[PDB]
């Protein structure tokens, strides 16, 4: 493309900007601009970025001094083998008796957030008042954060998502927990991976400290627009909020396609270690690879009526959550977030409508997570 045309910025809140579905050719990949010019690929078929993601040739470096930038991190920013020893260690906090211990909590959270909304109301900022808290809290309960500091750790984490200062005051917390930490274990993931790194076996402080910071930054502002930009596209699609009122299984299906149909982190970002032959292209050494998330998603080989919203679609294999090396760790934390949070404001306040035009919700742009600055809404019945 011979001026820089990517990202471009959503209009419609759950809808790729059309710039991107004409960008889509008959091909499963096609080429881009970024803001200085760099040349990019796009992979906009579902099933080759599913293959791309799996392979060992797209790099995660972000340290190689060329990779892209659209415009330093443990996990999501390095490739093998920092990045299979640093994720084998804390996979074991992300397991299902962890996740269960988790629901509870957020339960517990979710009725009170939704009891003081109807408090002051209505409307309310659904943004500011309800997602905004949640996946703090999450993040406070899997990192076993002193009960105490919630409250502390929330508000840093809401001045976070300009903001550096917040930041750096979770950094200085951080580290000083996790000394705390080490000198009287407690029960969390800092405490599971401060003894996964002593087996192994110098405590290496800096780096649990950024891996807590990474788990931070990857899991607030993605659900708090997961869960704002998912209830957006639920008030748009009234015709099934009853989907969320019916059993369990009917409600994680809700959460499975909003994650396809809205795709809040609309791409993911690499480079090619070695020429790739896809797609009737060689993709060579060197070169941007940008995986877009939302064409994927929207891709028709793979979800028949892209486009459409449907609670009751098989959506098992979408990449909301990305795919292979770096698919998200977090996922399952995600989802309860999701269904806890959605199921709970439906079943709570199931004519909930926006305060405002559609097209009035201010939304973020087009390099960021995508959904609403803040989100208007009002109802006039509550159970
Ligand atoms: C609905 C909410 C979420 C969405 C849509 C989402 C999406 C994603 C995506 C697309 C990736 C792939 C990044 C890549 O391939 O470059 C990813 C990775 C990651 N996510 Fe999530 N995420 C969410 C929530 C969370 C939460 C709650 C956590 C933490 C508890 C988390 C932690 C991570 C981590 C650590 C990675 C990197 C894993 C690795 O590099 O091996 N995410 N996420």
């Given at each position: 493309?011979?001026?820089?045309?990517?990202?471009?910025?959503?209009?419609?809140?759950?809808?790729?900007?059309?710039?991107?579905?004409?960008?889509?050719?008959?091909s499963?990949?096609?080429?881009?601009?970024?803001?200085?010019?760099?040349?990019?690929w796009?992979?906009?078929?579902?099933?080759?970025?599913r293959?791309?993601?799996?392979d060992?040739?797209?790099?995660?470096?972000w340290?190689?001094?060329?990779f892209?930038?659209?415009?330093?991190?443990?996990?999501?920013?390095?490739?093998?083998?920092?990045?299979?020893?640093?994720?084998?260690?804390?996979?074991?906090?992300?397991?299902?008796?962890?996740?269960?211990?988790?629901?509870?909590?957020?339960?517990?959270?979710?009725?009170?957030?939704?009891?003081?909304?109807?408090?002051?109301?209505?409307?309310?900022?659904?943004?500011?008042?309800?997602?905004?808290?949640?996946?703090?809290?999450?993040?406070?309960?899997?990192?076993?954060?002193?009960?105490?500091?919630?409250?502390?750790?929330?508000?840093?984490?809401?001045?976070?998502?300009?903001?550096?200062?917040?930041?750096?005051?979770?950094?200085?917390?951080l580290?000083?927990?996790?000394?705390?930490?080490?000198?009287?274990?407690?029960?969390?993931?800092?405490?599971?991976?401060?003894?996964?790194?002593?087996?192994?076996?110098?405590?290496?402080?800096?780096?649990?400290?950024?891996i807590?910071?990474?788990?931070?930054?990857?899991?607030?502002?993605?659900?708090?627009?997961?869960?704002?930009?998912?209830?957006?596209?639920?008030?748009?699609?009234?015709?099934?909020?009853?989907?969320?009122l019916?059993?369990?299984?009917?409600?994680?299906?809700?959460?499975?396609?909003?994650?396809?149909?809205?795709?809040?982190?609309?791409?993911?970002?690499?480079?090619?270690?070695?020429?790739?032959?896809?797609?009737?292209?060689?993709?060579?050494?060197?070169?941007?690879?940008?995986?877009?998330?939302?064409?994927?998603?929207?891709?028709?080989?793979?979800?028949?009526?892209?486009?459409?919203?449907?609670?009751?679609?098989?959506?098992?294999?979408?990449?909301?959550?990305?795919?292979?090396?770096?698919?998200?760790?977090?996922?399952?934390?995600?989802?309860?977030?999701?269904?806890?949070?959605?199921?709970?404001?439906?079943?709570?306040?199931?004519?909930?409508?926006?305060?405002?035009?559609?097209?009035?919700?201010?939304?973020?742009?087009?390099?960021?997570?995508?959904?609403?600055?803040?989100?208007?809404?009002?109802?006039?019945?509550?159970?």
């Amino acid at each position: 493309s011979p001026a820089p045309s990517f990202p471009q910025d959503r209009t419609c809140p759950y809808q790729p900007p059309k710039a991107y579905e004409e960008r889509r050719g008959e091909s499963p990949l096609t080429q881009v601009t970024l803001f200085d010019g760099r040349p990019a690929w796009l992979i906009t078929g579902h099933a080759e970025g599913r293959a791309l993601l799996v392979d060992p040739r797209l790099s995660s470096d972000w340290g190689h001094p060329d990779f892209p930038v659209v415009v330093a991190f443990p996990l999501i920013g390095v490739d093998d083998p920092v990045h299979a020893r640093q994720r084998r260690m804390l996979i074991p906090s992300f397991g299902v008796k962890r996740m269960n211990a988790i629901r509870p909590r957020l339960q517990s959270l979710v009725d009170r957030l939704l009891d003081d909304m109807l408090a002051k109301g209505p409307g309310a900022d659904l943004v500011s008042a309800f997602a905004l808290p949640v996946p703090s809290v999450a993040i406070c309960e899997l990192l076993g954060v002193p009960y105490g500091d919630h409250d502390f750790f929330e508000e840093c984490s809401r001045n976070f998502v300009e903001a550096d200062a917040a930041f750096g005051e979770l950094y200085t917390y951080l580290h000083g927990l996790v000394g705390r930490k080490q000198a009287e274990p407690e029960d969390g993931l800092l405490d599971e991976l401060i003894a996964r790194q002593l087996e192994e076996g110098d405590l290496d402080h800096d780096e649990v400290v950024m891996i807590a910071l990474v788990l931070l930054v990857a899991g607030h502002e993605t659900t708090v627009n997961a869960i704002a930009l998912g209830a957006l596209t639920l008030i748009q699609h009234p015709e099934q909020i009853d989907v969320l009122l019916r059993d369990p299984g009917a409600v994680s299906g809700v959460v499975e396609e909003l994650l396809r149909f809205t795709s809040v982190s609309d791409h993911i970002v690499r480079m090619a270690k070695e020429d790739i032959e896809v797609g009737g292209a060689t993709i060579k050494a060197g070169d941007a690879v940008l995986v877009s998330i939302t064409l994927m998603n929207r891709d028709a080989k793979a979800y028949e009526n892209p486009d459409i919203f449907d609670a009751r679609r098989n959506a098992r294999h979408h990449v909301g959550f990305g795919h292979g090396i770096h698919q998200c760790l977090g996922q399952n934390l995600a989802r309860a977030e999701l269904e806890i949070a959605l199921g709970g404001l439906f079943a709570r306040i199931p004519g909930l409508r926006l305060a405002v035009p559609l097209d009035e919700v201010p939304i973020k742009a087009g390099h960021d997570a995508q959904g609403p600055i803040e989100l208007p809404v009002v109802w006039h019945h509550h159970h």
